[PDB]
Write a protein that binds this DNA or RNA. Sequence first.
RNA 1: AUGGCUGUCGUCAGCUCGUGUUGUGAAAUGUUGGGUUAAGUCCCGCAACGAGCGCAACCCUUAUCCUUUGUUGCCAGCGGU
Length: 225
Amino acid sequence: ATVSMRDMLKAGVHFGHQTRYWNPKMKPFIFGARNKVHIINLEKTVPMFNEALAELNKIASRKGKILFVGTKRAASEAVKDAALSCDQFFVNHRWLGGMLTNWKTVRQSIKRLKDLETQSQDGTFDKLTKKEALMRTRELEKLENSLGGIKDMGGLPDALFVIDADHEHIAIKEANNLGIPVFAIVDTNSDPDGVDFVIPGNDDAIRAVTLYLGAVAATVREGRS
RNA sequence: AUGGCUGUCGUCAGCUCGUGUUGUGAAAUGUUGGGUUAAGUCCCGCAACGAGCGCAACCCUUAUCCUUUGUUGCCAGCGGU
């Protein structure tokens, strides 16, 4: 249910950012400065990695629903790969400011969406003009581009897994105003002071991210057993 | 002192709200930006997400044809003038 040290070195989780982009609040996680870029100390990661998955395993044991939030080009598809396979929810393209804190109004949008899939199956678009049809279908891809992963959820999730905390300060802050636990893959540029459970590591690699959420897909299945 | 009604800015494209969020606060954000349009018209991006009054459309008339009717309307195809 855990990962080893050498395979993490294979995915390049030690390759952080330059010294021109590091957040001074992560000095306890910096080994040294090789080639002018900070290198993450791996032996500090694995225990904190297990502190995260063990905590996430109990949340998954009580029939809990977690959220996978990754917006960058690396996890634009990787997040979805884990989601439906691990029976969870997600967002991968656009995080609407006020997705959880303003859940009362965004819930209006998901019912607005579920009407579109229903009208697309029975044959409601093939009785009216293309003027009203094609723009309504373009409204359907617009709504599934963001709400397509949390349409079949209902209510705000129990926990939350986020990638690149710097790029998702609007996401983790919404969980802080609710008290929802945060499991972040914090990088050298991000801030660790807003996360409940930090995991120092690189996120700018498709093989690195799949090593992360691919592993948490196993622990969530351990909770669903 | 007012209702009703009316002009005007101006048929100019703007004016706001709910919720969330930022700020001690007045307020801001949304409604900013890149293009576009007659138009916060539309698209993308975005701590914004949506909704309403507007704009547009639905109304009337005019320009084309078809179906239906032919009086007191009209005169091609045929007779008497």
